[PDB]
Each structure stands twice: as structure tokens, then as C-alpha cells.
Swiss-Prot record, chains A, B:
It comes from the Viruses. Aspartyl protease that mediates proteolytic cleavages of Gag and Gag-Pol polyproteins during or shortly after the release of the virion from the plasma membrane. Cleavages take place as an ordered, step-wise cascade to yield mature proteins. This process is called maturation. Displays maximal activity during the budding process just prior to particle release from the cell. Also cleaves Nef and Vif, probably concomitantly with viral structural proteins on maturation of virus particles. Hydrolyzes host EIF4GI and PABP1 in order to shut off the capped cellular mRNA translation. It comes from Human immunodeficiency virus type 1 group M subtype B (isolate BH10). Residues 20-89 form the Peptidase A2 domain. Residues 1-5, 49-55, 88-99 are annotated as: Dimerization of protease. The lineage of its organism: Viruses, Riboviria, Pararnavirae, Artverviricota, Revtraviricetes. This is Protease. Homodimer, whose active site consists of two apposed aspartic acid residues. The chain holds residues 501 to 599 of 1447 of the full protein. The active site is at residue 25.
């Protein structure tokens, strides 16, 4: 759809059998989710944002449905204050920015 | 233009007589710029991100030209790793997200 940016761009995702909302974030390279129960094994990683860095667990080949669209990708799960869908998934659902 | 997200969406801005590049960031409510010389009054502020909180100075009513569009608004100056254009200005230049 077209989304204007007067309000935060939030969507629903289905992840790991659970429903969340997430911010669509052109500024994030990758996707970072609040702490979840995800099946399987993972690699610890660290990412930095404003303020500093967090330690995150990386899971590869995860199915996410965002709106009706499915994608498989890496997600990082960790102590973010909310769920961020970054460019690695944003390309898969064919999202563009226009002005 | 329309911009795809295989690459970080960077744009050139002019602020304060200085030329910089900035990230177009739909996840950010406000614009924060790296520390840089700006004339005027300001108020102190803190913002939170992934990682933590930073202290930032707030200037209102600052003219920025982003690509070839002029916009006027609050900018927060501070210790960010990148200059971020957030939704306060993206709305002014008509930026839309589309998928
Ligand atoms: O830290 C933020 N990251 C950090 C980040 C880094 C990496 C990933 C995964 O690869 C995900 C998120 C981005 C901006 C940024 C990029 C690179 C270096 C430094 C900063 C993000 O793109 C921006 O949207 C918000 C996302 C967000 C928003 C609110 C709370 C937590 C996270 N932030 C923080 C931010 C908050 C407020 C403003 C102004 O209102 C600006 C930025």
C-alpha cells in the first residue's frame, strides 16, 4: 500500500506463530525483534544504534509474514524497545520510498 | 524520485551553509544530526534508541534543503553516528512509503 508518514509506519507481522506489530524502518539494515521464543539455534552478534550497542541473537532463515507477504531472512532478537523491520526484509516485500 | 532499499537511502542536505549526507529514516520521529555548528538558541533534550539514551540539543525552525526541497523544522544535534532525517521532515517533503 501507500503509507504516508504522519504517523509511525506500523504493520502486523506473523512470526514464530505469534502476531506482532513492527515499525517499517528504512534506516535499519537488518530486522530486530523484541525478545521472543524462536525455535532453534542462533549466533550472538552485537549491533549499535544511537546510545550504544546491544547484544543480539541472530537467527537465519526465519519465515516472517508482514502484511500478506512472506519473506525468509535473518532476524536479530534482543532487547530492542520495539520491533524493527529493516532493509533486509523490506527489499523482499518490494518496498520503496518515494518523494 | 523513487528509491529502492538495496542500498542505504542516503541524500545530500544543506543546513547552516554546510553540505552533508543524511539517511532517510522512517523509523525516526525526529531528525538528529551529528554535532555541527548551528547558530541560535537551543534547548537540551534526551532521546532514546537501541543502545541507550543520548543528550541532544534542540533547535526549532531550522531550514534544511534535502535533495532539492526546502523544509523547516526542529533538528536535534548530538552524538549520532549518522545524520538521520526522520518523519518530522519527511512529511514536509512529501515522502511516501509504498509496497
Ligand atoms: O537507534 C536507532 N537505530 C539503530 C538501529 C541500528 C541497526 C538496526 C539493525 O540493522 C536497527 C536499529 C536506527 C538509526 C541508526 C542507524 C545506524 C546507527 C545509529 C542509528 C534506526 O534506523 C532508527 O529508526 C531508530 C530505530 C529505533 C527508534 C526508536 C527506538 C529504538 C530504535 N534508532 C533510534 C532513533 C530514535 C529516535 C530518533 C529521533 O526521533 C532517531 C533514531
Amino acid at each position: 500500500p501507500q503509507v504516508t508518514l504522519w504517523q509511525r509506519p506500523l504493520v502486523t507481522i506473523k512470526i514464530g506463530g505469534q502476531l506482532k506489530e513492527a515499525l517499517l524502518d528504512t534506516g535499519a539494515d537488518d530486522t530486530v525483534l523484541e525478545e521472543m521464543s524462536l525455535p532453534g539455534r542462533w549466533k550472538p552478534k552485537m549491533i549499535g544504534g544511537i546510545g550504544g550497542f546491544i547484544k543480539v541473537r541472530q537467527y537465519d532463515q526465519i519465515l516472517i509474514e508482514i502484511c500478506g507477504h512472506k519473506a525468509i531472512g535473518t532476524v536479530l532478537v534482543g532487547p530492542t524497545p520495539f520491533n524493527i523491520i529493516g532493509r533486509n526484509l523490506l527489499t523482499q516485500i518490494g518496498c520503496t520510498l518515494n518523494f
